[PDB]
C-alpha cells in the first residue's frame, strides 16, 4: 500500500567488517572468497515490533575515491552505524578521533548505533597472540560501552558476520531507531 521506508548508512575503518555484515544480513551467507569493496545498494526487509520496514542499506569505504564519495551517502539518512572490529583496538580509537566528527558534521541529530564487529575473534588464539606483540588485547564489551557513552551513541551492539551472532539484533535496533527519526 505504502511500505514504511528508512535509510541506513554504515561507516568505519577499512576491513572492520562492514560489507560482510551487510551481505550476511541481506543474502544470508558469509562470503568466503570474493568480497566487494562496497555492497550493492540494497533494500532490506526488516520485521520489527509487528511492522514491515524497508531499510535502504548504504555501504561506504575510504580507499581510492571512496572517501571523497562518502559524503554523498549521508543525505536523508535515518540511522547511522559506526563500526569497529573487536580484534582491532586501533579501529575503536578511530571512532572518537575520526568517525564521530564526520558523522556529526553530516548527520546532526540522527541516532548512531555503535557496532563492534568480528566478535568471534575475541578469544581467537591467533588474534590474541598477534595483539600481545604490541601489549594489546581484543576490545572488551565494557570498552565498547565506554566509547558509546563518550560519543553519545544510541546503543552499543556486538556481532559476528562469520557466525551470524548478533546480526539480526543490529538491524532490528537500527530499524527501531530509524522509526523514531
Ligand atoms: N573473523 C571474521 N572475519 C570477518 C568478519 N567480517 C568480516 N571479516 C573479514 O574481514 C575482512 C574485511 O571484511 P569487509 O566486510 O570487506 O570489511 P569492510 O572493509 O569494513 O567492508 C575480510 O577478510 C573478511 O572476511 C567476522 O565477523 N569475523
Ligand atoms: Mg567494504
* Ligand 1 centroid distance, CA of 51 (Å): 30
Q: Quick one: cell of 70?
A: 562518502
Q: How far is the CA of 35 from the centre of ligand 2 (A)?
A: 8
Half-sphere exposure of 140 (CA within 13 A, CB side): 5
Which CATH number characterizes residue 67's domain? 3.40.50.300
DSSP string covering 12-70: ESTTSSHHHHHHHHHHSS--SS---SSPPPEEEEEEETTEEEEEEEEE---TTTHHHHG
Residues 6 or more apart whose CB falls under 8 angstroms from that of 5 comprise 43, 53, 54, 55, 56
- Does any ligand 1 atom lie closer than 6 A to the CB of residue 91? no
What's the domain count of the chain? 1
By residue range, what is the domain housing residue 81?
A: 1-181
161 lines ligand 1 (CB under 6 A): yes
3-state secondary structure (DSSP) of residue 168: helix
Amino acid at each position: 500500500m505504502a511500505e514504511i521506508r528508512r535509510k541506513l548508512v554504515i561507516v568505519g575503518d577499512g576491513a572492520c567488517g562492514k560489507t560482510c555484515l551487510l551481505i550476511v544480513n541481506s543474502k544470508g551467507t558469509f562470503p568466503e572468497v570474493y568480497v566487494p569493496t562496497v555492497f550493492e545498494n540494497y533494500v532490506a526487509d526488516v520485521e520489527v515490533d509487528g511492522k514491515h520496514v524497508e531499510l535502504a542499506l548504504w555501504d561506504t569505504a575510504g580507499q581510492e575515491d571512496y572517501d571523497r564519495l562518502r559524503p554523498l551517502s549521508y543525505p536523508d539518512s535515518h540511522v547511522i552505524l559506526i563500526c569497529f572490529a573487536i580484534d582491532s583496538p586501533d579501529s575503536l580509537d578511530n571512532v572518537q578521533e575520526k568517525w564521530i566528527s564526520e558523522v556529526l558534521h553530516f548527520c546532526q541529530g540522527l541516532p548512531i548505533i555503535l557496532v563492534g564487529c568480528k566478535k568471534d575473534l575475541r578469544h581467537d588464539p591467533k588474534t590474541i597472540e598477534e595483539l600481545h606483540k604490541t601489549s594489546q588485547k581484543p576490545v572488551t564489551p565494557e570498552q565498547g560501552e565506554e566509547v558509546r557513552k563518550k560519543i553519545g551513541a544510541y546503543k552499543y551492539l556486538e556481532c559476528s558476520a562469520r557466525t551470524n551472532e548478533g546480526v539480526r539484533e543490529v538491524f532490528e535496533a537500527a530499524t527501531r531507531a530509524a522509526l523514531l527519526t
